[PDB]
Write a protein that binds this DNA or RNA. Structure first.
Lengths: 293, 205, 104, 159
RNA sequence: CGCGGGGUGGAGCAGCCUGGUAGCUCGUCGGGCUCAUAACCCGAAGGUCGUCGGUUCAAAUCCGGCCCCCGCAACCA
RNA sequence: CACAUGUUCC
RNA sequence: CGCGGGGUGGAGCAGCCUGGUAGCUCGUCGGGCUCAUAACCCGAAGGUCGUCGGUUCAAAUCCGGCCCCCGCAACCA
RNA sequence: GUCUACGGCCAUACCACCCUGAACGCGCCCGAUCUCGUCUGAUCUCGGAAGCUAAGCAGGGUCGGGCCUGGUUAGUACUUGGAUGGGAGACCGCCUGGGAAUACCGGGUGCUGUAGGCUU
RNA sequence: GCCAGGUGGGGAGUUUGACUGGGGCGGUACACCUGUCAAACGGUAACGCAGGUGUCCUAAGGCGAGCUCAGGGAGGACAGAAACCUCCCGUGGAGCAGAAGGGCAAAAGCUCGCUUGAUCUUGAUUUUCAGUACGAAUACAGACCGUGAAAGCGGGGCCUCACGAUCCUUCUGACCUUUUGGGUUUUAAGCAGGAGGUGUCAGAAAAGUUACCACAGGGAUAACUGGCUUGUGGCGGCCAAGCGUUCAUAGCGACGUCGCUUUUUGAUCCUUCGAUGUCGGCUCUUCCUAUCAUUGUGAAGCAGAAUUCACCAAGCGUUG
RNA sequence: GCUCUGAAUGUCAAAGUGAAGAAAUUCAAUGAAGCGCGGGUAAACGGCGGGAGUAACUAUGACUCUCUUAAGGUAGCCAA
RNA sequence: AUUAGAGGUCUUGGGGCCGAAACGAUCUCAACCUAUUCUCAAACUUUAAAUGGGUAAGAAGCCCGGCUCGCUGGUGUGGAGCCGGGCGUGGAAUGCGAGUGCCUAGUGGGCCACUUUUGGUAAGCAGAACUGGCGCUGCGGGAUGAACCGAACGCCGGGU
């Protein structure tokens, strides 16, 4: 045989990692460099933009770290976009730009800074950075918390970044991870970036599946056909969406209805029950043994 | 040969075991710590006699080897060759040093390893013997003959435990009836009420 | 220790980082008219023998290497010293070693 | 004679506690330190930058200067029959807020509370702490039971 | 004892210093020449580098233990 | 140019 | 530390010079010769010419730095 | 009640196995035109929504291991101060105060902040 | 005659470390580092214990990214204990130049990409500490940069060691100061930062011998007694496996263990170095008993004889 | 150690020669003796090996092998 | 580092045994694994004292109001510095007048003891830690005595 590794001794010496690390959600190496503030700042919050793209949604939050836990000043989710006209495709790059733009304008509107710091209303895709206006409240500033996402060129977390800076957030960044930075020649053409922002890269893919195979097209886009969003009206849909966001970024929570107060989960068994089951298991094991005897 | 045992009797230094730092130590003279019918179960040797120390001193590995033989020899004549089981419960781990001469005197006088010795405490069992309770007066004479090979004074005590186990002879037999104790070769395994219930099934059937 | 023959570091005269040409520094010849040499040869003259100590108990087996940096900008033309820790062997920009390949 | 190495004899002092190795909990970093804060020093081996010298591990001082990552502390060090209030720059990880001063700060509140209170009531309420006084005279009831007897048990050889 | 040197086919020795890969002379064995042996001629076998453990991409070589051998010192009264 | 030796009862 | 001259096939040496040519000897391999080791004669293999940089149509050759070796000469932290 | 995003404490949260998961969600999953990256669209990046809770995840279970917290061990071991105390010594007792750790035996099995859902 | 080079113990002058269970020989405890000693702050000695250093590195420095190690299990043509491929387990059992300790798992490890923060410059502070330097280090600040999407991180090596004054020399730096009555130009001297080294490592330039010897001192220090100690030497117990044909103990007695003695040698260095005459023999007195003989007795494997063991016992002998 | 030979010559001082420079100065060529090189010399100072095998029983080793040095202690003599 | 038996499986191997042979069996003997078991560590450790080391126990403190900043910034934000005002039951016990500056001699051979402790067989030996002694110091006691126990000293009477 072979010696057992996971024995009594193994667990006596085992030191678990942090809960968020055992679950695989937080990189505490990068978090230590992100959240903590210089000691000569004294409770000056260090805001950071949290972008987490999931399978069916895009979550953009802005938080600053406190001792008891991060505090979210405002958040914008992708599942709100149907209000502003973006019916389907709530996780593509063009949707990420909207969620970032929504988060920006929603934050500024809670600071009375929406009139100032408009940003880029006419989206171009170039290297834009808002600078503070003298005599006015300083422009808001945060940093991007990519999390565990591999940050290569064209990652959707940078789409929300572009949406935020065009909304009026002073986020330090470089125009190198945007979709449009040609790697072998080291330049950036804002035009192709403007394509991904207005969702043109997927529009042609619907057009590509037009003459190639329509049945496979119906299989790759079903709710696009269900919501009647053809590649024709996609670019204007986002422009209508952006304008609808900048004019009403306020969020109205859903009305909270009182619920019947039931329990779907299984309550934890008590000691008396746990201790009595053993008496039944042993007794039944005997009263089944003399039946064989 | 080697110095008298008066030179190394008192626990004078910190324990100096044979290790990475103290290498080159000659082997101890005692190598066999169990003898007799050591391949015997727990139900045939109830009586257990001790040789308890009464001094915080050092017992050489040569005295341990000599006392093992003298106690072995007497039991063989008395209780036959297989009617007992001797267990020396002191292992010599402390290394003593000697600053042998051949003049230098005390310049750089850190000795070389001479031999090995066992640090015994007060009330600590030196040697134990289990046998049939019939042969009671035969072990007290075997241990009485073994004291003369040891410096200091020792008491011979007949334990209330059953054999070499840690359970009293008044409670041993029953704790085997309700199966708190399962005979495991020379000793016994205590069985609590804490394991998985499937192990309880394996015993009660 | 191996050192590349070129280093982009700070240039005092240019006031900023610039590429420098690295080369090893060596003692110049002892001038015959340095004040200490003039004073020495006047003290050594005549009778009396050796007047200053002569060091004999050599202990070090090495030197501190000194690099003679040199600004390559076509109009600055400045140099400066740059010391490094001791080493027995020393070479300028040779065989920039590779990571992982058969040895023989 | 011994060496004069900086981390000499700190085999256990700078070691991490059992099953407490690994990354540093971030709450230590997000902890503010004003000037004049009483602070106790405890070197942590996980972070080798800015460690205090071993003669300050366990000492308590007060902050006088705050930089980006570290603080300046004024600690009293006894040096052969004279005390020296000397300044050290230690990085945050080796630092805790001292809870020795707070119990005084807490006691100041009730003193300032029970002064403005019971002033208009006139009742003179004791403020100073007083040592544990000799306990009062009381009655011990033996209702029913009578005190059970204690007698030394007889000796019996253990070994 | 403390210090130093040494241990490599059957024999005597290099190689170690400074890392890769075992050689020299002789002997042994086989076949030839001779009536026969020796000499001579051709051909072959034989050590795994005292031993044990390390460092190293790699150790006869660098490092430590053990065993054996040899040399030098072991003075002032 | 070198090149030694010998088993022998009949 | 200065001067000088050496570093080349496995080994020694030439060629360096007044620049386009890398040869010899021994050793290694094959043939011939002899009774045979040898001896004798030829053939085959065996050199980044210490390394690096510059110059030149062309350097192992001129020039510079480095390294090693030898001889002589020097020696204030 | 419960989940998601970001957390604080960092096993009462881990590990093994088993059971059950409404709704939302998280996932698995479907693809490679574009972005991006691989020996390989497995990972990574990107575009999706046919299928599924099988797995992850959540909850519960185990006379579970571990961990946490007690009891016991035990006023024991050790120890501050004290004696013209004992003992040939080794060591020991007392006075004055302080006071542990296994084995063995119980109980416990994540709390929680901000923001947003679902059970309308 | 005057310079120059060689030779020159013929002659002169001087030197010929320190620590140290006396000195020498040997070591380096002489400058440093890790663990222990060390008595749970820190500090703490010995020629105490186990070791290490006079380096190495253009990356083994600096970022960022992605990965996960040692070992084991199960498999897969050649293929085996071991080549390579795959899956699973794997809290570090690996690796991080070196000694050791500490530290480290989406890293501080491994693999790539780009790089030169191993740069320029003020002070402050820590360590050793006199609270002086050097060395090393920690926090900043001003620049110039690197890297990364960014927060940031980086002014050498994950941390604890890897190093050096004045004087002199050398190099670098400025539209720099002086070079003397003024000016110009070489030269020289300054100012600032590196380097050439002192390892006896707060830093002289250094071989012996003296039995032909000298001086100042030292019992701080050896060679003798005496003292403490008793390893060693000597002497004696205890246990009893055995020996003794048989039979443990007539006489012995292993393996062990407890002591005594100071007629052996050591260990130590207390006394004596403004001197205690240092080997033996000769001579002569006295004392000790651990008794060879003699007196009186006990025991024998005591028939006698002879000889062994023991007791009281040092009276008297112990020679040529 | 001593001695002998030498332009066949590597090194070397002062002086002198030449060149460069406003000059101090710098560079070069030349450069004796002595060392280096090459001989001689021990009634000059001095020195003058190691390991295995081998003969009619044993023993021993005339003989052989090997490693080695400038030579490997010869004639003699000896517990002086 | 280390003693001993148990229960496992060919996980392998050692002589085999009926097997030509066969993890098929056979007794095995070993290592190997799983539960136990004896004995330890100055250079091991999960735990973990006693004694001990810091700091705090107010007026230089708390609490309001206002200005300054080139620092820090969603935000008269953060911090610091300034003014002005209000609060005295002096915020544990006990004891005690403190602070501060010049100039400065001698010393820089130490020794002893309780406890802790290193080398050594040990030493009236060598080396440390803590406190107190001796040295610098008499006196009562230990017959005697540098150091132990009591107690420290102007010159006397009485008492204890």
């Amino acid at each position: 045989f072979v010696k057992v590794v996971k024995n009594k001794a193994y667990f006596k010496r085992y030191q678990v990692k942090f809960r968020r690390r055992r679950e695989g959600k937080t990189d505490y190496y990068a978090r230590k460099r992100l959240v903590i503030q210089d000691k000569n700042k004294y409770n000056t919050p260090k805001y950071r933009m949290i972008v987490r793209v999931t399978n069916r949604d895009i979550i953009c939050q802005i938080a600053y770290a406190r001792i008891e836990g991060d505090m979210i000043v405002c958040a914008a989710y992708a599942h709100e976009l149907p209000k502003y006209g973006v019916k389907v495709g709530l996780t593509n790059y063009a949707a990420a730009y909207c969620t970032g733009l929504l988060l920006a304008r929603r934050l500024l509107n809670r600071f009375g800074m929406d009139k100032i710091y408009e940003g880029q209303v006419e989206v171009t895709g170039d290297e834009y950075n808002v600078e503070s206006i003298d005599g006015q409240p300083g422009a808001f500033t945060c940093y991007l918390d990519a999390g565990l996402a591999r940050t290569t060129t064209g990652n959707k977390v940078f789409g929300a970044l572009k949406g935020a800076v065009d909304g009026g957030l002073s986020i330090p960044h470089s125009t190198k991870r945007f979709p449009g930075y040609d790697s072998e020649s080291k330049e950036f053409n804002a035009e192709v970036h403007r394509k991904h922002i207005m969702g043109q890269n997927v529009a042609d893919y619907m057009r590509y599946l037009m003459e190639e195979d329509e049945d496979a097209y119906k299989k790759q886009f079903s709710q696009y056909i269900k919501n009647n969003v053809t590649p024709d009206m996609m670019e204007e849909m986002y422009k209508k969406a952006h304008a609808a966001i900048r004019e009403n970024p306020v969020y109205e929570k859903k009305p909270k209805r009182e619920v019947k107060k039931k329990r779907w989960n299984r309550p934890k068994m008590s000691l008396a029950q746990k201790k009595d089951r053993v008496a039944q298991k042993k007794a039944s094991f005997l009263r089944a043994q003399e039946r064989a005897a | 040969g080697r110095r008298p045992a008066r030179c190394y009797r008192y626990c004078k230094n910190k324990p100096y075991p044979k290790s990475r730092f103290c290498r080159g130590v000659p082997d101890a003279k005692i190598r066999i710590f169990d003898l007799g019918r050591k391949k015997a179960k727990v139900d045939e040797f109830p009586l257990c006699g001790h040789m308890v120390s009464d001094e915080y001193e050092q017992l050489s590995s040569e005295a341990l080897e000599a006392a093992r033989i003298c106690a072995n020899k007497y039991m063989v004549k008395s209780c036959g060759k297989d009617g007992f089981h001797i267990r020396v419960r002191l292992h010599p781990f402390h290394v003593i040093r000697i600053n042998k001469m051949l003049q230098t005197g005390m310049r750089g006088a850190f000795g070389k390893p001479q031999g090995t010795v066992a640090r015994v405490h007060i009330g600590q069992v030196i040697m134990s013997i289990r046998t049939k309770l019939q042969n009671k007066e035969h072990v007290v004479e075997a241990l009485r003959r073994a004291k003369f090979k040891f410096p200091g004074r020792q008491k011979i005590h007949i334990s209330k435990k059953w054999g070499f186990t840690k359970f009293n002879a008044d409670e041993f037999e029953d704790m085997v009836a309700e199966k708190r104790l399962i005979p495991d070769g020379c000793g016994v395994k205590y069985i609590p009420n804490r394991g998985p219930l499937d192990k309880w099934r394996a015993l009660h059937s | 220790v191996n050192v590349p023959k070129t280093r982009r570091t700070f240039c005092k005269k240019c006031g900023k980082h610039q590429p420098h040409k690295v080369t090893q520094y060596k003692k110049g010849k002892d001038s015959l008219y340095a004040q200490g040499k003039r004073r020495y040869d006047r003290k050594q003259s005549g009778y009396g023998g050796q007047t200053k100590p002569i060091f004999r108990k050599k202990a070090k087996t090495t030197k501190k290497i000194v690099l003679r940096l040199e600004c390559v900008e076509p109009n600055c033309r400045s140099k400066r010293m740059l010391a490094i820790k001791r080493c027995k062997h020393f070479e300028l920009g040779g065989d920039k070693k590779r990571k992982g390949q058969v040895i023989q | 004679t011994n060496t004069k190495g900086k981390r000499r004899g700190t085999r256990y002092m700078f070691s991490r506690p059992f099953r407490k190795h690994g990354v540093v909990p971030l709450a230590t970093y997000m902890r503010i330190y004003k000037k004049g804060d009483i602070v106790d020093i405890k070197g942590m081996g996980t972070v080798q930058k800015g460690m205090p010298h071993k003669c300050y591990h366990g000492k308590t001082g007060r902050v006088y200067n705050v930089t980006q990552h570290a603080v300046g502390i004024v600690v009293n060090k006894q040096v052969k029959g004279k005390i020296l209030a000397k300044r050290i720059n230690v990085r945050i990880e080796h630092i805790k807020h001292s809870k020795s001063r707070d119990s005084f700060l807490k006691r100041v509140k009730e003193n300032d509370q029970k002064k403005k209170e019971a002033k208009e009531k006139g009742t003179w309420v004791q403020l100073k702490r007083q040592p544990a006084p000799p306990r009062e005279a009381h009655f011990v009831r033996t209702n029913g039971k009578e005190p059970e007897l204690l007698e030394p048990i007889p000796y019996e050889f253990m070994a």
